[model samples]
Target chain A: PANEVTLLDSRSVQGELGWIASPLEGGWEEVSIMDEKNTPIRTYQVCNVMEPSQNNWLRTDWITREGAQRVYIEIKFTLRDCNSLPGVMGTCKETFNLYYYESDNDKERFIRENQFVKIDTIAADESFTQVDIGDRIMKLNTEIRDVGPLSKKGFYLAFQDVGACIALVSVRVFYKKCPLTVRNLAQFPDTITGADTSSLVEVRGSCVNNSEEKDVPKMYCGADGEWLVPIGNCLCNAGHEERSGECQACKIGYYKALSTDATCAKCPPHSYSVWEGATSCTCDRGFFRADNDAASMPCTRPPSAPLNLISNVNETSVNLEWSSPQNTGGRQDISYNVVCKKCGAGDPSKCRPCGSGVHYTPQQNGLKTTKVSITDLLAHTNYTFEIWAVNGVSKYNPNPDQSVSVTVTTNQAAPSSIALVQAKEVTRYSVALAWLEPDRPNGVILEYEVKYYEKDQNERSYRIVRTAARNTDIKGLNPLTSYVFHVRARTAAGYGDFSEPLEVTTN
Target chain B: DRYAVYWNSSNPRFQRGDYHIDVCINDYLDVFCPHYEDSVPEDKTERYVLYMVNFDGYSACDHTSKGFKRWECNRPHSPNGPLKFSEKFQLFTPFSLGFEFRPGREYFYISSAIPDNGRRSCLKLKVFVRPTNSCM
Candidate 1:
């Protein structure tokens, strides 16, 4: 909504209405002028001055209007040449300058301070020929000046004339205003338009107590009836984000845990929030969250068992090796523990803890590496080794760890020497020999070997005998002669060291 | 940019005699033991323990391994402990006590556990709450 005010009209006033003239010696005077309708009206005109340096000036009183957001001014005037004598033009080639001021101080002080700002200058020259006798009278010309959308307060206008004659018949001042408006999230009542269309006014609204805040909305109301951009607006509540000047709920798989000025965040790994506008996410199935785990930390599960268990065996030690688990439960804390057990041949359930003599190099538990060397194991013994993998969530319910096992038989070695050897039932022609098993039979003893010879015979004359039983009989021995006997044990690897020589005389 | 920070000896930054951190108001500074996750919460030898004390108690490095006679902190001897837990979170977060922090305030904490030789100089923390200006 806008309106125009008629600030001044020379004919509307019976006499001077706060109008003043400058330069008391060459000032303006009031006179009568006829309008286009042939109606007589009053006008203010500049008087003639003999010296070219002398000038006439007229100024209006303070033109004010209440409720004015912007203002505009328009004036109608007449310019003419003075034609009082023949063969000479008294005043012509007129020029005037317009000035305005918004202050309301004393007129003398305003002039003394030079407070007026230049609006524009006008040229009022008329082209005409002059004749001595029977010449046409100089014609009066209508002219206009327009001013605009300026300060909303009262203003004073002054005009200065250089030559010719000029009259101000009427002056009108106008102002513009804005209408009240409302918005969905914010609003303003009976807004105030600025001094010009380019100016902006703050449209304060609610938000501080209810939610967070931002720059208060500001509006641009142009007198030309065009809408422009508004600067800023309000904020939304928690679990929601602002978009297109409105509050919107967070999408699925995203969350906003607090009422903060931040965007929605994607859910943590291995977790999801299926509902819109969720503040937190839940761990997926087969995953676990330990005590004191943060809401933003990823969910994890127990790691799978170690993979590809391999072993290298020697006569007394076995080195077991394996690879890391294929899946570490989405964590980097995967660790391993190895167990050693002695079991019967082809019977895993008959297992028992390996004896104290068995030692594992680099430990058998809490091992980060996948290899271990188990030493001091008996040769040709069956042992079982199992390796398990663990992770952070492995201690919780349904600990999902699978251990891999490898059973191996160490390499064989020769049996120890026969500890006891004897010749019994000595007779003139034959003798019986008996032997006990070796104390340390590194492997299964397959057979026994015995050698006999006369006590004084040479090595080349000895006789060799073999037996599968513990006892054996010798035959065809000389009477009244001493014989030497040597017995040893045999295994798949080789023969053991022989027992001490036994001597007997044929009875 | 995590909303919560774990307080434990596993963090190498806290192994020193004194540690300080600046966090925004309303951020979570949770107290928990990560290395002794497998130990029962009541086990004195295996589990990790600490106390929330005043500046004097922190400076003195005072507090027995056993927090109280029968009913304080989360100990097995005291099932009805003063420390509380929330259903959504298993940690002893300060928010469970309705505790709110103002901007530009300094809070102190200490522990007497020897993990990483913390008992010699004591494990101390000075948390400085910082302002976030005006955000919603």
Candidate 2:
């Protein structure tokens, strides 16, 4: 036996209006029904109704005519509570079971519920409930199914209820034709056209009747339109400015000669450009521009004099002193160019500059004077010297009055008597001895020759020992042996007469 | 018979010139001869007996060499039997006799008596001797 209950459209009524109020002492109160205005129309102590799982069903079935063009379904639910419910409590009163058939005869048939769709419960407890109505208004499938003589021609759906306590305030259904399909649309100007087309097109026509119904409007495509264009010129990069087709000359301090040809010429010799936009070059510190230079130029000066000059002359060696010139410009500070050579039959002008080993010094103080003591000369040897004061440009006093040529004599005078005194012992075999400068020690002493005669040997047949001091010890002797010793000093000036022999015993 | 009596002058009131009286001649004879009887030996010079007692009332021969000896003797019969000497002497009041000996080698013997006036007198005799042992 089958029961044919009246198949009312759930969307036409207030859907299935129900609520799960939180009780004073936890648990939900008895279920109750409400009218479209939310006034309690009826209350039922529906039993055996355990808290549904997240996918509980609360749906109603209805029947509709065939050839229904579109079906609109709107389900709204509210969280209603006066006294606040506990924060962890959850209650749901969703309208989940929604089904429909073509005729009353098919209403009694069971329909399978849809599983994938659902609406979340509303969560509010204030005087006014916060409603969370379903935004999805799905269109039922109209495809007919084959059966005996009677085939189903209409559609139905399930609400897939879920979540905390909520009230289904209303379920609305309205029908209409489906919206047009728009492709490749530009949202800004509301136009539909394929991309990659550069033509300007206008959108034509106004929106249809439901334009005010909170629906997205439709757009169409037409023809070309005008567009705004820019009007001006481009500027060049730094160090350059636009001219014709290319960047013109660079500013003063820069050089435009590079392949880029985008800048101006740089300053020439002895000058520098400090900044990119400089109009001209400037001279650096310790320098000045030449009188004819267009801009400041580095000062020109002669090469510096030889540095670390020292004199190491014996009797015949010339003593010279010098220091390198300071390139500073001032009359009080100038360099001296000196030349020294052996005077002979060679052309005097043909004398080359002093050789590398020769000494040279700057005479910023005006004179470059030195002394040369020639000794052990070949009876006569002549030497020449020339000195000049030089500045950056030219030499002044090319040949000073101080220039001289001199010859040396044989130094026939034997040095005065040499005195011997023991100084210090450097080692067992060597002794460092210094003596009173010889009585007539004019030139640098080069060496002293000492002679020792074994007490048994004649003074005339003694062994000679030589050093560079008036005082020297006769070593390499037999310990505890007596010996007669004497010393004579010698230099490039010549050897001194030997001292009278003195006898000594060595340990 | 003649006897000489001496008293210690160290008594507090026994000044040098204080009187000394003897009242015991007869009395002493009576006590000395109380036992003399009919068989008296007759050599008094050849026919009579004479007894001489010490100042302490003991016969002169009553001295013993060892154990304690006791003797009872009678008083002499005649007043002149032998003049008795009183040996009870008095010392100076608060008298002091200073003596010293090594820590363990000294001892003393002392005796006392009552005089007719109920006064007491004593004599101390000191003996200085070493123990009978090998030298310490």
Candidate 3:
């Protein structure tokens, strides 16, 4: 039921006698009229739906025939009411039967198919007492498949109005027609014998197995006679390594990448193609190969460098250390080299290389080519250091980043001296001592030591209290015993001088 | 009369003003008073009293010694009778001081009131003080 044609205008009707009257609603314009001079029988040419050629067509039907729920039609008649000049009209009885054509362009074929469809009347005079003798409401219905999809270009829908006295007011039809449609791309002049074989994934025909044959999807035609689609008929779904016989598959071990007749490619070395039409195989990444051939090589030397590089700076030198990179990039002969430059806090690479003898050797201490110590660095300076590992690439082959580098700064030194020491909460058994940190810290302070001693006494002694913070409590001393406490800060370069001592006494 | 509270000898004490208490484990404060009953001889002078103390400053960094600080925070009053000592006057922290205490840093308060007898009466009581007990 593919061909869908709808006719509404009275002029669309053809018969020995049919007239045009006032229009009606329902998307239909006017009804066709017929009377005395009109012939008893007539025909409406419903076209294109039933052209049974030996093509992809099987059968055709009028929507109101097979298994359909109902053939719903509407018709209003100029009934014999009070204002009517009583003529020879009886029940206003009208007999309108439906028909279909087996030939769209050839009536000879249609005549051989059906001279008359021989259907019963849809609405007779029996229900003249319907909703309104003026508006009788009811449902009429009756419907097919050859399942050959239909084309709408040449299809036509017809109408027939036959009654003695009632001038036809309006007529309408509702039905279902199923026909052929294209794939993502389809072809006309294509559906060959029976089924309007569907297609898939940009292909005009259904999924396939063999090679050499792609869907030459049908699009436009003179018989099927319409294009109604984007990709047209019989082009080249022609799948093949080469366009061999009609559309055949390729030989094993070969593959055709696209839907053209190009030669099949090999499934590369380590890769295989057991079927006749594979597109590609393994050994296809990072590089390539040919049938039965060797694959590309693996990359040498990983692309990362050493890490966590830091330094311990002194008044006159530095001790720089670092951990080696996790990978040698497939080569263990990797050695490291450090470069130093004058860099600002904002920019690490803005300086020159350090003075001579900044290089250090890796000790097999951990049984791994890791850890180094750069020494003899000029102290109290802005120096940025970057170290990289090389698999002898620095001596021979050179590639960008053939070595990786990590950067660190040398900011280690004795912390600037602390100021303002405090001996708060002094009492008999315990005393609390605290100090302010130096504003200019050259290096991180490791910890602090508070040294307190009994002074001006015959049994004088010195005691030490070790702590990480700048404050602590001193305990256990004779009552009325006098003690003096001093503090100092320690950094990588060692401890600073004891600050001025504060007198303290336990409560 | 000069009287003071002690957390522990050498640890300082509970006091009201010219208040003071002492001795500690060096041996004296606790032995000097009995359940706050003391040798100050409540019969000799009016304001002679000793406070057996307890520590409750286990408050958060933001808490008051709260109710314990209540005695400190509030001004002392003139008594209707001779100022006397009562073990029953132990102010337990009954309010939400709203601060958590630390076990590491241990401490107590000293509150003693100098007699308003118009003289420095260090003679209100001639006695050593003891430290407040532990746990709570």
Candidate 4:
């Protein structure tokens, strides 16, 4: 009963075609009432034979409201030539077409393409009379919209004419006003705009409970007709804990979670819980608290384990470097312990506690560094080390829920800057090269990788020669060809980066 | 007709030759026949030895030729058209392909002609062919 509303009635509507000024074409104002909802309804009559060459037969202005929802357009029209006036102009017979549109541009386009729906065609005849004999009635229901000053608005009821002569007797369009339903409890408005009320069961000022927070007082209509309490009617005056009623900011270490009117919540775990109402808490570094879904849940430490455990295998030991765990479960200091074993490639039970010297920090860093090299390791030996970050936090300690380990095998390291790589004998199809022994030849000079290839080719298809001594010869080369040479001392572990390329040519 | 070429099988003429030719009319008429400008009856006709002669300028038309030549081609106009020469009638045969004809040497002789000397071999041919017709 509260939602029922009468919008447009030709009967007593006091205004101009310009009031709605929904101006189309060939329209008129007349006093005539036919029938609607069991009673006589009045209308703004329009003719329906819109031939581009002839004056338009039908076109009417639009109707705009706060924002239209659904409206019923009850139209009673007569497809007829009620009067014959050949000397001037008169109604004729043809099919009846109708349309509903928002903008003028696209509708006119659809009109020419013959896309608008043809409601019906009544062949009104004037066989022996001075007027047409046959006529018909049509009704339409369309939900409406338009661009608004504030939101998506449009309540334009539009029409177009393509054929037939017709007259509208009565046009009554109205709809149910969302029962302006509001919960009487939430915040109340300062005044009421519409009469039929809440408790009074009328719409305006109903303070509808449309969302999650229900008890916060919301609606009421203003006295002079403007909606004082816009949006789901509400007031600011008093009650409620967080904002001293309307104080926006909260009372420190508190959060309101969502929309206005919601009471404050105590700040959850993590970082700073600062001053005032419904405040925010910044998660600590290496910490996270998901917002969307976890807003209501308390936070805990990061899951576990250290990240990026890596190494530098020297002649007799390994120098390791690793990053702190991401979630620290929270990247604070969590304890780490290492467990590596000197395992053999020979047997399952052959491994033992690493005889490494744990105290050597990557010097410069000295004794205070996080890790040291696994010293006293046999050359070419394999070992595994495990580490983890604490998963839980006490006021004191950080620890891991599980362990992460890394494995490495030592190489016979015959180290570096293999200096003074020199050229030896040069011949038509051959050339020889020599280089100084490595500075840290941890292992005996097993072989020398004498690398040579055409310059700028950067080809991996380089020719390699192995020699136990520091010198090696390359033969069968292109005669009088340009060549470059470099060498690296190698043992079992692996090869090193070659020295700068030596530019030499075969004679 | 599918044209295919393998090394010419052993014959005594071409690596061997097997050309069943009928006759060759002398090219007595000049570039523009006198009838082209003068008074020849519209109904008059000729019945000399007519040969449909064509050569792909120099490709397979005669590879080892010394100059302009008409290869010994009998099938220049296949089914309806060699699509390649009538096309040349339109002057489309790329002259650059002139060095492309595999050396062609045909020692042919007109059975009963005036010279009556011996079989003549065209290191190449000089085109002065008569379009289809008869002669006196």
Candidate 2 lDDT, A126-173, residue by residue in tens: 233322123212112121111112134544433333443433433444
> What is residue A182's positional error in candidate 4, in angstroms?
5.2
Query: Using Cα atoms with residue i matched to residue i, what is each candidate's TM-score against the true structure?
Result: 0.30, 0.18, 0.26, 0.23
Which regions of candidate 2 fall more than 4 Å away from where they truly are? Answer: A1-280, A288-304, A309-336, A339-507, B1-136
Q: Is candidate 1 or candidate 3 better by TM-score?
A: 1
**For candidate 1, lDDT tens digit of each residue in A201-234?**
6555454333455557666666543334656765
Q: Candidate 1 i-RMS (Å)?
A: 42.3
Worst 10 residues of 3 chain A by lDDT: A49-58
Per-residue lDDT of model 4, residues A416-463, tens digit only: 757677776878877877778877766445567777678644554777
**What is residue A413's positional error in candidate 1, in angstroms?**
14
- CAPRI-style grade of the A/B interface in model 2: incorrect
Pitting candidate 3 against candidate 4, the one with the higher TM-score is 3
In terms of TM-score, which candidate is strongest?
A: 1
lDDT of 3 by residue, A1-507 (tens): 235333332323442223221122111122111223432222121111112211111112222222222223334433223123223343223334443332345222222223433334444344332223343333222211122233322222233433222223334443322244433322122322212433111224532234322334433322232333545322223225434323445567665556643455655444444566455443322222323322222224332566444345555445555676775544445565555654634544445544566544443122234545554555445555555565532233344353333333444545675677877777767778779877666656666777877777776566767788877985566788677877777654444667777776566
Q: Please name the candidate that would achieve the greatest lDDT relative to the true structure.
A: 1
Per-candidate TM-score, first chain only?
0.34, 0.21, 0.30, 0.26
Best-to-worst ranking by lDDT: 1, 4, 3, 2
Cα-lDDT of candidate 1: 0.59
Residue B94 local lDDT, model 2: 8
